[PDB]
Structure formats: C-alpha cells, structure tokens
Amino acid sequence: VSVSGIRKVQRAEGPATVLAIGTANPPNCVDQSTYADYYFRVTNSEHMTDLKKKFQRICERTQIKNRHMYLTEEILKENPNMCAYKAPSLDAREDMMIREVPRVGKEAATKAIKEWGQPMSKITHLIFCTTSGVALPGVDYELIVLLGLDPSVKRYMMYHQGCFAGGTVLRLAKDLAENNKDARVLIVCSENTSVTFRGPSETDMDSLVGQALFADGAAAIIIGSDPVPEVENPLFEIVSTDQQLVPNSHGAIGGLLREVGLTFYLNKSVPDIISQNINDALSKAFDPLGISDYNSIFWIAHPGGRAILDQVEEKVNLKPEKMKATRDVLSNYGNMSSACVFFIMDLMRKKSLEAGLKTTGEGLDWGVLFGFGPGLTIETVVLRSMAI
Amino acid sequence: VSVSGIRKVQRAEGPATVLAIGTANPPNCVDQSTYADYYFRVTNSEHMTDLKKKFQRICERTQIKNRHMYLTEEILKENPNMCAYKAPSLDAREDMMIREVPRVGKEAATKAIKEWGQPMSKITHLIFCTTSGVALPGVDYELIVLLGLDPSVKRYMMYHQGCFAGGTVLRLAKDLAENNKDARVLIVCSENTSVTFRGPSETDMDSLVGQALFADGAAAIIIGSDPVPEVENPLFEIVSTDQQLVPNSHGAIGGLLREVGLTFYLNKSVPDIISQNINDALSKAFDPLGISDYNSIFWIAHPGGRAILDQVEEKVNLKPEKMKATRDVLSNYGNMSSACVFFIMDLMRKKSLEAGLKTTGEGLDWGVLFGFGPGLTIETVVLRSMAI
C-alpha cells in the first residue's frame, strides 16, 4: 500500500561488485606472423602484390601474436561471398553469428557460474552484448535456453554497441545490482568476426586494417551488491561510470549493417582523438576521489589498437607496465571488441593473486577501465580493488 | 574515500515517475477500409484474386481504422525490391530507417521536453528503442545531435527488441532513475514499417497479416525519481516490473533480419498463449499489493491484435471499457510496436483530465501495463496513478 516503503526494502545497500569472471573462445588460433599470406590466399587476391606487402606491415606493427577465430579455411571455402570484398552474404554471416555467439557465450557463463558457486536460479538479470546476430527472439533468449536460466530473468539485449560496450554493460549492471536487493546480474559479451570478415580492396584501407585487428571471444561476469560473506568473493567494486561523446568524431570509428555484412571504417586520427580527450575523463572521474597521480592507480584499457595505447600512455605519462596487462590480452587474443576489458580484468586479478600482491588491482586500491568506440564514445569506469 | 558513503548520497529516494509524454507520427495516413486494394495494387499482385479477398477480410477484422506510414505510393515506386515479396532491399530499408527513426523520435522528444518544462541539459540518460536501423554510431547518437542533448548523456541503444519493448524501457528506466539522484531519463521508442513492408505470398500468410497491423510512430517519455514540487508534474509511478518467458512459445512471434529486410511470423495461437499465461503475471504483480479484483485497476495493454485483447478480456473477465483506451489507439494508429503503450498511456491521462476524474489512471489508484512479444515474452508493469 506504500510505494515509498516498497522502494526502501526493495533496494540494495552497497556498491555493485564483480563477483566472478569467465572467458572462452573458438578453438581455432590464427598466427599473425603468417596472416597476410593466409588472408590474401583464401581471398584470392594474390595479384594485389603491393597491397599484400602492405597488409604484412599492418599485421606486424599490430602487436598481435595470436587471434581466435570461428572462421576456418574450410568455412571460408563454403562461403565465397564472404571471401569477396563486397558480395551479398548478410544472411550467411548472421546465421553463423546467431549460432556461435550464444554458444561461446554459454561456455564463458558456465565457467563464471562455477567460480561464483551460486545456483543458476539466483541469476536475476541477463545483459547480453554482441556486435550482431539479429533474430527475434534474440541471442539472449538462446542463452537462457542453453544455460537453463529462470524464465523470469530480466533481459537486456545490447546489439551493435561498438568497441566501447565493455564500459556500457558495467554502467548498466551497476544500476541493476545496486537498485535491487539480491539482484545478481550475468553479463555476457560475445563477439565474433563472422559479420566483419571480407576480402581486400585497393580502395578501402580502413577495412583492411580491421581484418588485422578483430578476433573472436566471449566473457561472462557476475555482478551484485552486498556480497554474501565467505560465500561470495568480491573482486572489484564499480565506483562510478561516465560516458562521453567527443565532438566532431563521427568519422572516427563506425560502420553500417549491409547486404554484404558489417562494413566499417577507422580514421587514422582515433589515437590522437582518444589522447586529446582522455584527461578530461580522468579528471571528471578522479578529482572527486582526490586522485591526481594516474600512475598510482591500475589500468584496464580497451585495446583498440597499439597506436592508441602508445598515445594515451605518452599523453598521460604512464609507466610502461600500466599497459602491460592490456597489451598482453591484445597480443594473445587481438581485438575482441566488448570482451577485451574483461579478459584484461580477468588476467589482472589472476596475475595479482599468483604474484602475492595485496589487491586484485596489481596491489593498488583504485583503478580505471576505459572503453573506446563509434561516434567516438569514451566509457570511463572507476574501480576499487578488493583485498588479498 | 568511502564507496559506501558515495552510494548513500548518490542514490535517489523515491519511485521512478513518468513526468511527461510526447508523441509523433509520419503525416501520411493510410485508410484501412481500402488498404487491401491499395496494397495489392502497388505490389502488382492483382492476379492473386483470392488472396486479395482474403487480405480484405483480414483488414476488416483488424479493428484498425487508420495507420500512419512513412512509406508513400511514391516512395514505393522508387523501390521495386521493397514491393516484391522477397527481394534484396535491406540496404534501402535500413537507410530509410536510419533517417526516419531519429527524425520522428526527435519530434516526440521535443513535445515531451516542452511539457516537462525543464532544460535539455538536465536529461542525464537516453534510452532509444527501435526495431531496426543499424549503424555505428547508432540512431541514439543522431538523436543526441538533432536534439542537442549533453555529450555526457548515458546512452542505452535498444535494437530489435520486439513488440514487448514498451515494458522493457520502463523496466530499465526504473533502475536508472531510482538509483541516481537527479537522474532524468528520456525514453524514445520510435518504430517505422520500412523494414517489414513487402509484397504478398500465397505461401506466407503470417507475413500478410503483419502487413495489416504494423504502423509508424514515436513516443518520448521523461522519467525521474523525487519530482520537484510544483515544477514537475508526476503522471504515473512505476511500482514494479516483471519479465516472463512463456515455455514452448518460440514459434509464437518472431523474425529474422535478412537481405530482403525484416521477415516475421505470427502464430494463430498467440492469443491463447497470452490468455493462458496472463493470470500468473497478474498474480505475481498484484498479490503483494493485496489486489484480487482486476477490474478495480486501470489497464494499458499492448495492442498486438484484436484477438489478443478479446481473449485476455474474456479470460480475466474485464469490463469492456477496461480495454477502451487500448482499442482506441489500435483503431487510430494500428500496431506501432514498442510505441503503442505510451500512446495509450498518453490517451488515458488526457481523457482522465478532461472528464474530471480524480487520477490519471481513469480515476483508479492502481493499474497494469503489459507488453507482448518474441519468444513470447510478457512484460508486466504495475503503475500507481497520480492525483487530480
């Protein structure tokens, strides 16, 4: 009879906390030092001698050593339209996406659930983030079925978000967990290159670069406020989440869903863009916490490109090591879009534990996580580490 | 220095409240009593004499008198692939969607903002819901630009949600508003039939029925907790939001994004499905409030189809009038997907005011809002009306 009273007992009390992380990828590993050759071969573009030499340079300075990919040489053969630069292939790509995205996403969820140790039925919210794979019902539905989630789970299907979605899902999860007592959110970010893979064009260089960066992978995260003592194991607390649109940056990063799959472009200026606007976001997120030394906190940055990492580090004046975990993931998995920051988050706490550091954030109390994407969006999440 | 303290002062105190509603539609009005003829003519399907007579029956029992549509006879002529049953036309449809969805959505937002009376800069969150129009950055970005929203607005781009999204955006808005002090959420649900319009097929009857129900329209809603006395005008409070998946219903409602646009299917059993599962949702949402008489509360139901409304009303034993507002919108606008419930919400409070009733909900204190869609999802939102 009292909406005010309901609200008072319905809400959680503490900050949203990362309780478990799980990751998975398609088995197939593609070696970067030989991709230029593999790529130009399966695409039948050997006559583009100059472009090939060019693509080899790209893959070298990419600082990527390995990438997991659902697409095999066999799957490519059965799909000529996908090997071409631009040919009708949206239907075939979406079917692969619709089938693989939920799949790898489930593998990651299972690992997170096992770590978390709580029963399936306790998951109250489901945030599924993926670049594509459009169906109705959507991929979130399939995840529910494959995983066995409760039919009353509140769903949040985030399609075509962009490379910054890692921050998006955390920003959304914060509110879901904090506003509802006992709410336990399952985030599943599953990315797959099936929609973006295509042949080379002497006229579309941006598209050629993406063929060197994107990879496949999924990450599952359990998030909740008020962790149960001894039963649940808090890893990181979400302190604050900001989203910012950098003016005059639409042409920076983007793409369109077409009959020839997902196209995309990447301006050579994104590193400058991100670097010139990065300090305002840091100030907005750390001035309130009285933090001025950005080397005194740990980092987790989207690995959009090596140039980006170099620029930001150079501009903010960050010890090398601050970007080590981030570069480590980029080097072993490549650019898995929204899934990257969680692989880095996972890696950081894993390494911190084995090295005997005092906190999950490389022994430091505060840290920041960044997401970079379309329209040139910047997600800035402040994170508090957890002890031991 | 204290994450617990921050949380304590960062959160709102009261329940999320609807503060303003604004709607808009493409100018073009299509008369239902003559659509069968118009449809078979512009599609060049006059030879399907029997199917045409069949489609005329469909449009009659549809209980739809008018529908707003961006697509004109002229726009259809310039687009043959869209007039065909199934032909490559995804690119053309998406471009129309990308251009019109943000457009009509802005027109609706402006009306809501005017009513609300507060400055643009006060909008802290943006939830944009639309069936399609895939781009990166997305339609939400364009809305920000067209409208002049703050570059730090937190965005939530909800693509391909389904006919139940009206409840989805309210469920999401509840958390955003309630968990953040001063948070003011702008919801923009903009739907356009450009992706679903196509020619008739003697073999695809479900697709033919949809050609009779879907229409174009946009709705904007401002939502916030702790309304400012005298300055802000609370219309409805969001009490609770539930989402439910009805088992074995995947084939009920759905569709796939293809090279030929957005396809879809509608099982003849959805009315039975919705009716047989409707009481569990009512019980789950009203037993806690001690409400057993469903005629003692006001209604706002997605107008998926007349059969649905008839069935639910018959099963729940609802006075005729309970569904009057809902049928009114269905009759003047048709099925505008996620935008429907807000046109009904708007209509209900408008009518309640002019009739001199004591509350915005037809003079009753409590009410329910339902969303029906893919995988056969049911959104059940409990709403408290506001005085005078």
The total of beta strands of chain A comes to 15
* Portion in helices of chain A: 25-40%
Task: Summarize the biggest pleated sheet of chain A.
Answer: 9 strands, mixed
CATH topology of the largest domain in chain A: Peroxisomal Thiolase, Chain A, domain 1
What percentage of the residues of chain A does DSSP assign to strands (E)?
A: 15-25%
Largest interface: A-B, 67 and 67 residues
Tally of separate domains of chain A: 2
EC number (chains A, B): 2.3.1.95
Organism (chains A, B): Arachis hypogaea (Peanut)
InterPro entries (chains A, B): Chalcone/stilbene_synt_C, Chalcone/stilbene_synt_N, Chalcone/stilbene_synthase_AS, Polyketide_synthase_type-III, Thiolase-like
Domain Chalcone/stilbene synthase N-terminal (chains A, B): 6-227
Structure report:
2 copies of one chain form a homodimer. Chain A has 388 residues and is α+β, with helices and mostly antiparallel strands. The first copy, chain A, has 2 domains: 1-234, Thiolase/Chalcone synthase (Peroxisomal Thiolase, Chain A, domain 1); 235-388, Peroxisomal Thiolase, Chain A, domain 1, CATH 3.40.47.10. In chain A, 39% of the residues lie in helices and 22% in strands. Chain A is built from 13 helices and 15 strands. Chain A has helices at 3-10, 35-42, 49-61, 73-77, 80-83, 90-116, 139-147, 165-179, 205-213, 270-286, 306-316, 324-333, 340-354, and strands at residues 17-24, 29-31, 66-68, 125-130, 135-136, 154-159, 184-191, 217-224, 236-245, 253-258, 261-262, 265-266, 298-301, 366-373, 377-385. Chain A has a 9-stranded mixed β-sheet, sandwiched between helices. In chain A, strand 10 and strand 11 form a beta hairpin. In chain A, helix 2 (35-42) packs antiparallel against helix 3 (49-61), helix 6 (90-116) crosses helix 7 (139-147) and helix 10 crosses helix 11 (306-316). The longest helix of chain A has 27 residues, at 90-116. At the A-B interface, helix 1, helix 6, strand 5, strand 6 and helix 8 of A face helix 1, helix 6, strand 5, strand 6 and helix 8 of B. Chains A, B: Residues 237-386 form the Chalcone/stilbene synthase C-terminal domain. Chains A, B: Keywords: Acyltransferase, Cytoplasm, Transferase. Chains A, B: InterPro entries: Chalcone/stilbene_synt_C (IPR012328), Chalcone/stilbene_synt_N (IPR001099), Chalcone/stilbene_synthase_AS (IPR018088), Polyketide_synthase_type-III (IPR011141), Thiolase-like (IPR016039). Chains A, B: One of its GO terms (cellular component) is cytoplasm. Chains A, B: GO terms for molecular function: trihydroxystilbene synthase activity.
